Amino acid sequence: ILSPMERFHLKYLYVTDLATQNWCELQTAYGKELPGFLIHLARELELHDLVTVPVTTKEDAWAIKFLNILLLIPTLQSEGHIREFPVFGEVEGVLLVGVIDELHYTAKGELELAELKTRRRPMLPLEAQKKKDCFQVSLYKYIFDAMVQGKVTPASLIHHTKLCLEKPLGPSVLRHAQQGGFSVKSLGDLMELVFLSLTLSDLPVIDILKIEYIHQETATVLGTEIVAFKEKEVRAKVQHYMAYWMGHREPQGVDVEEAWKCRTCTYADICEWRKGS
Ligand code: SF4
Incomplete structure (x- = not known):
């Protein structure tokens, strides 16, 4: 009988979805089952699946x-800095879609992913x-690396x-494209050029994963995370x-040990785990 998908x-x-699944998997499940409850604008417009034109x-x-x-690909390779880069790829039998917030090259020539997290309170x-x-x-690095290495095909x-x-x-x-100098023939031809540009433009794998926490008003940095990427651990988690x-x-x-997460969870009054874990 039916799977959650x-x-x-x-x-x-x-x-x-997988990030909040790391917070609470049941809470993410309830979020899909009962969606009536529940800024980087391109990622927010992707979550509600709105689009640019x-x-x-x-x-x-x-x-x-x-x-x-x-x-965005030639913009990154010439200007060294882009924002809101779309990523997608099949991960363990499920297509994963996302929007990288910022990609840029450090002065040492390393490709760095930047993730800015703003906070209301300086905590x-x-x-x-x-x-x-x-x-x-x-x-983001897991999907991006697969994209630029030829592991994500139009067929998938x-x-x-x-x-x-x-x-x-x-x-x-077709209007949006021709105004950018490009003439799309078919969706299939467009997908094939995306594959070529992703894999043959000397796009390296992401070298640095950088998370920054900022208090909005005072612009005070509340912490900086340089993520220690281990692909075997990452793959084990998405598999799970x-x-x-x-x-x-x-x-x-x-x-x-994290039952405090349920204090502010919308589905606390219907969660059977909150009663008997
Ligand atoms: S009440 Fe707690 S265990 Fe249940 S869905 Fe919410 S956060 Fe998860």
Whole structure:
């Protein structure tokens, strides 16, 4: 009987879904089952799945994302700095989608991912918040590295998104592209150029994962995290997390040492884990 992906009618998952799954897996599950409850604007517009230019078909929305990538790649390779870079790729049988906030080259020529976290109150981030945030930026590197190394193909995206390449691209898509100097023929031709540009433009793997916490008003830095990426640990975690989404195990609540997370959880009054873990 249905897996959570089928039950919640999810064709793919967002990077933040797995980040909040690190906070509480049951809370993330309830967030998909009961969505009626529950700034980087491109990532926020991706979570509600809005898009940059008029949003009719899903082939149009993905075509816009592909045109953005084709422009951001040479911008990064010449200006050394870009923002809001879309990432996607199949991870353990599930397509993962996200938006990297900032990519730039350090003075030593290292490709650095920057993740800025603003806070209302000038308080240090919790250990549980840093665990989750470190997992999020590690996922960005996991997907990005696979993208620029040729491990993410147009076929894999079509399989999960059910994009139709027979449907021609809308005028708002073709207008956005021609105004950028590029003439898209078909969605299939666009996807093939994205693959080429991702893999043949000398894009290195991400060298630095940097998280910065800032108090908004005073601009005071509340901490800086240089994430120690270990790909074997990262893969083990997504394997475990995707095992729930694909339906191979039951969702888990928080550990008893972190029962304080339930104090401000929307679904505390219906969670059976909160009663008997
Ligand atoms: S009440 Fe606690 S265990 Fe249950 S979903 Fe919320 S955070 Fe998770």
